[PDB]
């Protein structure tokens, strides 16, 4: 049959979720952004297209912080990125409030992952239109 | 509710260039002087110091509120250590707001709080808030016994507003330190060890830990015999 790419949580007959794959297209059309891991940290960098000399230089910041130790950058639909980051901030606060230790980087990855995966579960939401690079330094 | 582990006076005053604030290092438990490593001066940034008496657990709560405030002020704020760093007046309004909301939900934070610091424009900040939401500002502020013994001494250095520019860090710190001794003489819930903070529009945030009351006068006690007629 046909039709399998108009709602979100729908399996196509070859096992895919086309709406997620269509979300990737928005990501691919985004600015290029990277992460490099080094001996004791991480670096984040991103390309800010100067659409017009009318943009104030230095002033449309794209890299966001989470808590005090985590950096996040993303490519694609910027407002989706902020959303995911906002959630990340809440998720990092909950963890610290109960456990005191600031959230370990892998534990933070799964917090984001679980939430983003959540938006592939129902046709009443669309997937996140961003791929996100993030990281930091933790107890090990 | 009802307080349990508690901390006593917090005293402070304004001088020509900044403000001083101090409080002893004790968490009493009823009449048991139970905990001795207790810091009740909470610095926030480089320009604000929040001193707290009352219930120690609620103080531990108000501290984390303040760490959270700092953390979040940084979010998406590339000026969070400059033009957009947290101001003392912001930190006070937040706490004042929380304190009164909490009273009004009939679940108070069992505290008295003094926010001392220096505004971005140099002005001195010094204001009080307590478990009822009451707020006031004066050239001297104290909680607990300090309002009864410290204020009379500190008010003798800076009685009027015009005295503030005449008072120097040296005069003011000495007043503060003398007061802490008076409180150690006469407050049954005080400790000899105490912490003291200076916030100066020029020298910044000096935070002195681990002071002790010195130069106490006790010698006359040897000449005190009995309680009236007893002669030996
Ligand atoms: Cl609030
Ligand atoms: Mg008791
Ligand atoms: Mg101490």
UniProtKB/Swiss-Prot annotation, chain A:
It is found in: Cytoplasm; Nucleus. The alpha and beta forms are probably products of the same gene with different post-translational modifications. The proteasome degrades poly-ubiquitinated proteins in the cytoplasm and in the nucleus. It is essential for the regulated turnover of proteins and for the removal of misfolded proteins. The proteasome is a multicatalytic proteinase complex that is characterized by its ability to cleave peptides with Arg, Phe, Tyr, Leu, and Glu adjacent to the leaving group at neutral or slightly basic pH. It has an ATP-dependent proteolytic activity. Belongs to the peptidase T1A family. Present with 12000 molecules/cell in log phase SD medium. The 26S proteasome consists of a 20S proteasome core and two 19S regulatory subunits. The 20S proteasome core is composed of 28 subunits that are arranged in four stacked rings, resulting in a barrel-shaped structure. The two end rings are each formed by seven alpha subunits, and the two central rings are each formed by seven beta subunits. The catalytic chamber with the active sites is on the inside of the barrel. This is Probable proteasome subunit alpha type-7. The gene is PRE10. The chain holds residues 5 to 144 of 288 of the full protein.
Curated annotation (Swiss-Prot), chain B:
Gene3D superfamilies: Glutamine Phosphoribosylpyrophosphate, subunit 1, domain 1 (3.60.20.10). The keyword Phosphoprotein does not apply. It comes from the Eukaryota. Belongs to the peptidase T1B family. Non-catalytic component of the proteasome which degrades poly-ubiquitinated proteins in the cytoplasm and in the nucleus. It is essential for the regulated turnover of proteins and for the removal of misfolded proteins. The proteasome is a multicatalytic proteinase complex that is characterized by its ability to cleave peptides with Arg, Phe, Tyr, Leu, and Glu adjacent to the leaving group at neutral or slightly basic pH. It has an ATP-dependent proteolytic activity. PRE3 and PRE4 are necessary for the peptidyl-glutamyl-peptide-hydrolyzing activity. Present with 16900 molecules/cell in log phase SD medium. The 26S proteasome consists of a 20S proteasome core and two 19S regulatory subunits. The 20S proteasome core is composed of 28 subunits that are arranged in four stacked rings, resulting in a barrel-shaped structure. The two end rings are each formed by seven alpha subunits, and the two central rings are each formed by seven beta subunits. The catalytic chamber with the active sites is on the inside of the barrel. Interacts with CIC1. This is Proteasome subunit beta type-7.
